[PDB]
Design a protein around this ligand. Sequence first.
Ligand SMILES: CNC(=O)[C@H](Cc1c[nH]c2ccccc12)NC(=O)[C@@H](CC(=O)NO)CC(C)C
Ligand SMILES: [Zn+2]
Length: 491
Amino acid sequence: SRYEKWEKIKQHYQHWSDSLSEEGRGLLKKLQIPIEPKKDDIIHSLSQEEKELLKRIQIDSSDFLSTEEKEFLKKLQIDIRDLSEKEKEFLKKLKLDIQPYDINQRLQDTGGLIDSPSINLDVRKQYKRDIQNIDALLHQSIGSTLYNKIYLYENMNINNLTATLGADLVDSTDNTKINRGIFNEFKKNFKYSISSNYMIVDINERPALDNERLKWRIQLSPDTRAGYLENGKLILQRNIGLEIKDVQIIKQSEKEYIRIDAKVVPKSKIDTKIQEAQLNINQEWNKALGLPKYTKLITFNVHNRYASNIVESAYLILNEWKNNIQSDLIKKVTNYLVDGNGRFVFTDITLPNIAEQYTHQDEIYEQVHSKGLYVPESRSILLHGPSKGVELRNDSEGFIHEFGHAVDDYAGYLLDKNQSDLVTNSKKFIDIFKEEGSNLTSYGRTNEAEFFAEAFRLMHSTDHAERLKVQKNAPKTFQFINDQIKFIINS
Ligand SMILES: CNC(=O)[C@H](Cc1c[nH]c2ccccc12)NC(=O)[C@@H](CC(=O)NO)CC(C)C
Ligand SMILES: [Zn+2]
């Protein structure tokens, strides 16, 4: 029964609990409840000019802020009151000062690569101290008597794993039901999972919050280390692997959920699978694209809870890429990327924590997290699995947008090989952007490079209506891009 189970586990950990120092207990509380930035500090730091600037900014308009970041900045605005390049620059620096201190989020965002230079040095070092301390606290395993007598439970927002499927998971017609087509897409390549942070799990299953439609049931290993937390919870050691055993729809009080049955396994077992897959997909695509033996183009940087889908979807994404773009274009541009040690990075950690970005972007205010990125300095395409591109149907479309940036790069390279610029920085394209730049997607308005990439993506849609739309509504752009493709292919 529930309370017998709770009693047994609490008692198992009673000596551990009683042995905790005040610092140890304080750290565990710090872990459960992140420390929010103080609005007072921020506002006092601002000058009259910036206060004047912040007062007028339409925060909703920002494309590069999270909902939570927007709320906080909205509250800042509210406390002060009582689209342009200059405004974007100010927000990019200010976004730095508004991050909560959140150990589990730092671990998830970095996949445990906590030296990544994506947060200020002082806080970066404090995270490291705290994580080392918590690691040392968690020395006691669940054991051989309890591991197969108890399940542990975790409710989860599907957007943590895939916001792309999360958009459609709940039946649009009926709150209470799960879309079974979307369910099947979720389940298809979900075979293993990694926890890079400290899982906080319930001893007895609890009702999910409204935005949580995933209900994990987890079997621990006898060797899994953990600590008891008040109110019938365990905190699990970080860096564990999970094998997915079963994924099914369940119904609790007339409301449908996805049950995920998982079993804890050594993380090394899963990491080995990811590394083997990485070699296999490179071997396949080296042969397909006629790349030299031993070329390392594709990288799996995979550390989080939808791990196997990052891997499996990379195959599908590259297939869609090859199926929708001219072969000569794909071969010439990819060879150019490889010549500069470029990578296709598929990842479930945030993009500022990817070396192909941060090695070339020292300033945090210049680092970007997004669905995807092209980094000319490393000739790399980065694609973030869990997020959803706002105007995209699927992840393949995001990859093709980034490949459009690589096309822009190579086309510009061919024009002047010794000083290599983007073709979107040419006079011809700048004039075209200023004329037609509002005629396609909302995001395509951002600047020349994004307009090119968005037009390129739409021109290679599986929806022929979308290619037509570009030709009709942005004819100069359509022609320009086809001219660049011909230019590259005839080189
Ligand atoms: C996750 N939501 C999104 O779709 C963000 C939102 C966004 C708009 N402007 C920004 C500036 C900085 C960071 C994020 C954003 N946009 C992107 O991911 C696009 C970034 C891009 O152009 N990469 O080449 C790629 C997409 C078209 C596939
Ligand atoms: Zn882009």
